[PDB]
């Protein structure tokens, strides 16, 4: 057994948070660099199930388009999460301010995001997080889900789970999470990488939530789409987020249909 192996160098922080700190760790034998997550026991009363079944969610995830678990050191209050290493970033950085990204960078990125959520769904689980700063990108600029904190599994034994749970981030959150009392997963996830298909083409979020009181919400459910920040999208994107950013969730394009949407087959462009 090769020595020193197990000795991983805690070369910096990546991205301190609410839970804690993320360091960057390269191998002190192979140099294999990855990145650890610092999950802070403190308190007992609000902390411990909460890392509990953010670990066993990453036990189950496997894909190419999903932050890569590796393992979990336990000690005490210092809970170490061992995930894959993303050289390239936050996607969120690739977006320039107030105007977005090249088009064509937009679709390989709304590519791969969908093949990660389909994912996700197909084993019965939903993020409820996604925005730009939860997709990564590694060297290959090769978009990765990430941060699984939230996720919860809505689909166990063929059945599937009604959430009533408020959580995510305002600007991303669909508007049946503000309105209803139960609500199904899977929409709630596409509203989101709607959201996020926006914020790639045009560079700014729509509106601070999804509700009436909010202007911006209303002028898009009037379809004033002209000067306002869609005037920024192309007619083609702009019809897959008339189908998207659908309110009544029952009505909102599913995933396996916007496979189907022209813009999302359309290439290059
Ligand atoms: O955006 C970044 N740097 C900025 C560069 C421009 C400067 O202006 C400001 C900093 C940046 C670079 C490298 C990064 C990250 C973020 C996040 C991150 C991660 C990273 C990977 C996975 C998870 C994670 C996965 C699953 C789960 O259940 C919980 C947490 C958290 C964090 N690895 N490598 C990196």
Same mark, same amino acid.
């Given at each position: ?12 922080? %990546?991205? *301190? ?9 390269? $191998? ?11 999950? =802070? ?8 199930? +909460? ?6 969610? $990453?036990?189950?995830? +496997?894909?190419? +388009? ?7 050191? !336990? ?5 170490? &999460? ?11 950085? !690739? ?7 090249? *088009?064509?960078?937009?679709? @390989?990125?709304?590519?791969? &995001? ?13 993020? !409820? =997080? ?7 990108? =590694? ?10 904190? %939230?996720?919860?599994?809505? !689909?166990? +034994?063929?059945? *599937?789970?009604?959430? $009533?749970?408020?959580?995510?981030? %305002? ?56 000067? $306002? ?32 949407? @022209?813009?999302?087959?359309?290439? %290059?462009?």
């Amino acid at each position: 057994a090769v020595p020193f192996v197990e000795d991983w160098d805690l070369v910096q922080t %990546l991205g *301190e948070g609410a839970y804690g700190e993320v360091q960057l760790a390269v $191998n002190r034998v192979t140099e294999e660099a990855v990145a650890v997550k610092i999950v =802070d026991m403190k308190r007992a009363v609000d902390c411990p199930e +909460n890392i509990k079944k953010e670990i066993c969610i $990453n036990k189950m995830l +496997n894909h190419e +388009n999903v932050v890569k678990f590796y393992g979990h050191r !336990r000690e005490g209050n210092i809970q170490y &999460l061992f995930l894959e290493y993303c050289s390239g970033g936050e996607l969120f950085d !690739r977006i320039e301010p107030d105007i977005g990204m090249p *088009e064509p960078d937009a679709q @390989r990125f709304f590519h791969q &995001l969908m093949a990660g959520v389909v994912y996700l769904h197909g084993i019965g689980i939903t993020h !409820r =997080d996604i925005k730009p700063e939860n997709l990564l990108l =590694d060297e290959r600029d090769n978009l990765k889900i990430s941060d699984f904190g %939230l996720a919860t599994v809505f !689909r166990y +034994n063929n059945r *599937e789970r009604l959430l $009533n749970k408020m959580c995510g981030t %305002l600007p991303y959150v669909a508007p049946e999470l503000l309105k209803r009392r139960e609500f199904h997963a899977e929409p709630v996830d596409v509203w989101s990488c709607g959201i996020v298909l926006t914020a790639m083409l045009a560079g700014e979020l729509p509106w601070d939530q999804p509700s009436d009181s909010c202007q911006e919400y209303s002028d898009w459910k009037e379809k004033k789409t002209y000067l $306002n920040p869609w005037k920024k999208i192309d007619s083609a994107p702009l019809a897959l987020l008339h189908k998207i950013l659908v309110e009544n969730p029952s009505a909102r394009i599913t995933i396996p249909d916007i496979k189907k949407d @022209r813009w999302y087959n359309k290439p %290059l462009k």
